């Protein structure tokens, strides 16, 4: 996942 | 090439590598057209409304309720032309990844990482777990079960929420018990993220418009790294997080980042995981591998007829790099385990892929996205296997000019700004  | 065939979405189904399939989502679904691009790896050019029957609505919720970093478009990937471009884009990224030694190493580990056959109730028989398979419609219209390791599928409602998804087990935690499970990566090669060249700006939620574009190959590689951890069942429990204390903006909001994400990014981010806990995890998975070795020792018979008992026991001997004594029992060698564990967790990282691709990229996972761009990497005049956006022998070859959205503006259309919305 990419995140913020 | 990693993908020996240049598939076209409209190519007729053959029931082998181009076929209508159904996935084991424990629910009902109409078959979807899929393409097998490499041994154990399939691509489904559809929005993912299947792996999670509760996320089958692509329609954008009310404008009033929709978090910061997200992008909705219920129509994306609904036409044959889009699916054709999606297939070609995903294929191109696999080739870009495979063209590097690191990518070749990672993809090889992924193909060898067949999910463990631990779906039997009797410890004397080896049986496959059906959720690590897909049902392929054969030419005669009948379904046949095929084991696979990886599926690349389009995103669900939130187009930019890329992630690895896999079917769980009633009792076994397949991604954390060494077994492994088929990985479904929600991903799109048709969009990318904008970041900033200055660290102080990139890690600040109030600054930057997203001057540079992330190379989609890195984004896919990031997900493939997670897939690698999960296929070997060594993913870190998402509850194990780092209470970010190195970014005032993360801190003021008490944001936490999982160790699994820090490990995957690598570089200095990986250092936020203390030695004490790293040792804990390492020992935990070493023991899990030990259990797999013992389960294989007790296996006296095999269920099905897709392979011989000797073949499957050897398949996992190679996957887990187990040792075999005079008698014929398997055991886990400390050196070999540490080498494999280290390869999957420290060699395969986002930071290392950046070094191999020679691209500009976020310097840390602990930043703030600036924007999302629409792109098209299929045309060679836009993106290549060898150089990504920074095409050699052109004005885009140096200084990451190809990723510079201001210089190479014809290759990026900003769809949404995230800055100021956190
Ligand atoms: Na966030
Ligand atoms: Zn991630």
């Amino acid at each position: 996942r990419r995140g913020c | 090439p990693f993908v020996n065939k240049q598939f076209n979405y409209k190519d007729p189904v053959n029931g082998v590598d181009i076929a209508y399939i159904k996935i084991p989502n424990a629910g009902q679904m109409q078959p979807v057209k899929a393409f097998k691009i490499h041994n154990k790896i399939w691509v489904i050019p559809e929005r993912d409304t299947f792996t999670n029957p509760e996320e089958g609505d692509l329609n954008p919720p009310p404008e009033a309720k929709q978090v910061p970093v997200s992008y909705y478009d219920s129509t994306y990937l609904s036409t044959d032309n889009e699916k054709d471009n999606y297939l070609k884009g995903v294929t191109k990224l696999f080739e870009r990844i495979y063209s590097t030694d690191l990518g070749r190493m990672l993809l090889t580990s992924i193909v060898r990482g067949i999910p463990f056959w631990g779906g039997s109730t009797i410890d004397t028989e080896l049986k496959v777990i059906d959720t690590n398979c897909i049902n392929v419609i054969q030419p005669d219209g009948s379904y046949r079960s095929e084991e696979l390791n990886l599926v690349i599928i389009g995103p669900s409602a939130d187009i930019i929420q890329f992630e690895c998804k896999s079917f769980g087990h009633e009792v076994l935690n397949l991604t954390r018990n060494g077994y492994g499970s088929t990985q479904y990566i929600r991903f799109s090669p048709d969009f990318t993220f904008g970041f900033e060249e200055s660290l102080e700006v990139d890690t600040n939620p109030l600054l930057g418009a997203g001057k540079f574009a992330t190379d989609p190959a890195v984004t896919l590689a990031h997900e493939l790294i997670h897939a690698g951890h999960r296929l070997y069942g060594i993913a870190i429990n998402p509850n194990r997080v780092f209470k970010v204390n190195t970014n005032a903006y993360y801190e003021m909001s008490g944001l936490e980042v999982s160790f699994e994400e820090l490990r995957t990014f690598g570089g200095h981010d990986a250092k936020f995981i203390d030695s004490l806990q790293e040792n804990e995890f390492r020992l935990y998975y070493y023991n899990k591998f030990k259990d797999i070795a013992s389960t294989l020792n007790k296996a006296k018979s095999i269920v099905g007829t897709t392979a011989s008992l000797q073949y499957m026991k050897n398949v996992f001997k190679e996957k887990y790099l187990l040792s075999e004594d005079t008698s014929g029992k398997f055991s886990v060698d400390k050196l070999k385990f540490d080498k494999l564990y280290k390869m999957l967790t420290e060699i395969y990282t986002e930071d290392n892929f950046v070094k191999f691709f020679k691209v500009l990229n976020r310097k840390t996972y602990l930043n703030f996205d600036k924007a999302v761009f629409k792109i098209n990497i299929v045309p060679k005049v836009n993106y290549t296997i060898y150089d990504g956006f920074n095409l050699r022998n052109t004005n885009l070859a140096a200084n990451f000019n190809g990723q510079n959205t201001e210089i190479n503006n014809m290759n990026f259309t900003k769809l949404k700004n995230f800055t100021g919305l956190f």
Side-chain angles (χ1 to χ4, degrees):
Chain A
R1 299 193 182 73
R2 283 275 311 188
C4 296
Chain B
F2 191 71
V3 184
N4 268 306
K5 301 168 68 175
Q6 300 295 63
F7 293 115
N8 297 119
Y9 187 68
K10 293 179 177 176
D11 287 338
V13 294
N14 53 44
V16 181
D17 54 347
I18 303 183
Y20 275 101
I21 68 172
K22 285 189 177 183
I23 69 173
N25 66 302
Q28 306 302 309
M29 69 173 276
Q30 290 301 303
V32 294
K33 194 175 186 178
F35 302 78
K36 186 179 182 172
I37 60 170
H38 189 280
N39 182 36
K40 303 292 187 176
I41 306 174
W42 293 72
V43 179
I44 302 178
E46 300 288 335
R47 293 290 289 282
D48 178 26
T49 58
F50 312 107
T51 68
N52 188 309
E54 291 185 0
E55 304 187 310
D57 186 5
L58 304 177
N59 295 182
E63 173 178 292
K65 180 180 181 179
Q66 71 190 0
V67 297
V69 185
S70 70
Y71 179 66
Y72 297 88
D73 174 10
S74 61
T75 75
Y76 167 61
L77 204 57
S78 61
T79 66
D80 294 327
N81 186 28
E82 287 177 286
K83 295 181 185 179
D84 187 60
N85 203 237
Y86 178 94
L87 181 59
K88 287 172 168 52
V90 170
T91 293
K92 194 160 184 178
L93 294 180
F94 267 95
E95 294 301 345
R96 178 150 168 68
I97 292 171
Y98 195 59
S99 78
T100 65
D101 281 327
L102 184 63
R104 173 185 56 65
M105 290 164 62
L106 170 62
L107 288 168
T108 297
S109 289
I110 285 173
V111 176
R112 299 179 185 297
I114 293 174
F116 186 64
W117 277 38
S120 58
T121 176
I122 315 301
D123 55 59
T124 188
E125 68 173 6
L126 280 177
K127 189 166 70 171
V128 65
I129 295 177
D130 56 49
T131 55
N132 292 322
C133 302
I134 54 168
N135 291 302
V136 187
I137 296 180
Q138 303 176 288
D140 68 348
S142 66
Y143 282 96
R144 69 180 172 75
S145 178
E146 186 177 317
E147 292 174 62
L148 73 178
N149 294 1
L150 179 69
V151 174
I152 306 302
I153 187 167
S156 192
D158 186 349
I159 295 179
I160 56 179
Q161 273 312 145
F162 304 158
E163 54 177 4
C164 282
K165 295 196 77 254
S166 58
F167 296 113
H169 188 281
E170 180 165 52
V171 290
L172 305 163
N173 289 180
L174 305 178
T175 68
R176 303 196 297 288
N177 77 337
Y179 279 32
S181 57
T182 302
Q183 297 302 306
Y184 288 77
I185 299 179
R186 283 174 174 181
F187 173 79
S188 172
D190 304 306
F191 304 87
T192 194
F193 308 90
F195 67 95
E196 288 289 314
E197 66 276 13
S198 285
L199 184 69
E200 290 190 301
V201 174
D202 201 54
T203 60
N204 192 295
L206 304 177
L207 300 174
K211 180 171 183 174
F212 284 90
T214 296
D215 186 319
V218 172
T219 301
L220 177 58
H222 175 103
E223 294 309 321
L224 289 174
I225 288 159
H226 282 304
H229 300 158
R230 299 165 72 86
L231 278 167
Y232 282 83
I234 60 172
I236 300 174
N237 192 313
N239 65 178
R240 305 293 288 180
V241 300
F242 166 56
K243 47 183 180 63
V244 183
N245 47 46
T246 51
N247 187 303
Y249 296 102
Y250 269 67
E251 309 171 16
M252 59 173 77
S253 190
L255 296 177
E256 304 185 306
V257 176
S258 77
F259 290 148
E260 171 62 24
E261 288 295 350
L262 297 176
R263 160 172 290 177
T264 297
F265 183 81
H268 186 284
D269 280 20
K271 294 179 178 179
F272 290 125
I273 305 172
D274 59 60
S275 297
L276 294 170
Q277 277 174 159
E278 173 59 69
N279 292 321
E280 180 189 308
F281 301 136
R282 186 181 295 94
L283 174 63
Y284 185 75
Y285 298 120
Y286 171 67
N287 291 311
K288 289 299 182 179
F289 273 38
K290 286 167 60 183
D291 291 311
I292 295 173
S294 61
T295 293
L296 290 172
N297 291 314
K298 297 182 291 183
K300 256 61 181 179
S301 62
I302 185 174
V303 181
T305 30
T306 60
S308 63
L309 174 61
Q310 287 292 66
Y311 188 75
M312 292 315 298
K313 294 187 72 176
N314 186 296
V315 167
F316 296 121
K317 179 183 184 177
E318 313 184 83
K319 175 186 179 181
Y320 301 109
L321 297 173
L322 304 175
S323 296
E324 186 187 304
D325 51 55
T326 62
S327 299
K329 285 69 180 183
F330 291 124
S331 62
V332 184
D333 186 68
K334 192 192 184 321
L335 286 169
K336 297 185 178 181
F337 172 76
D338 282 357
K339 179 185 293 183
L340 177 58
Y341 185 77
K342 187 271 199 63
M343 178 69 68
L344 293 166
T345 63
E346 289 174 40
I347 299 302
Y348 305 156
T349 63
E350 180 174 329
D351 194 59
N352 281 336
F353 268 103
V354 171
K355 300 182 183 301
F356 278 78
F357 292 136
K358 294 287 290 181
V359 296
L360 192 63
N361 187 261
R362 59 184 177 188
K363 300 289 190 296
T364 179
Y365 189 82
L366 304 178
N367 69 348
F368 288 99
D369 281 6
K370 311 304 178 187
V372 56
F373 296 101
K374 181 70 185 59
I375 61 179
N376 182 11
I377 71 176
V378 174
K380 286 185 177 180
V381 296
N382 292 350
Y383 186 101
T384 62
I385 293 173
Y386 312 101
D387 301 317
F389 291 113
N390 307 312
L391 309 179
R392 58 169 59 77
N393 307 311
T394 70
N395 64 304
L396 307 180
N399 301 139
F400 314 113
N401 285 344
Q403 296 180 77
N404 187 316
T405 68
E406 285 167 38
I407 295 176
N408 190 19
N409 64 299
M410 59 174 271
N411 272 100
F412 308 96
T413 295
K414 185 177 293 183
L415 303 175
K416 180 177 176 181
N417 278 300
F418 304 131
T419 300
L421 298 178
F422 300 85

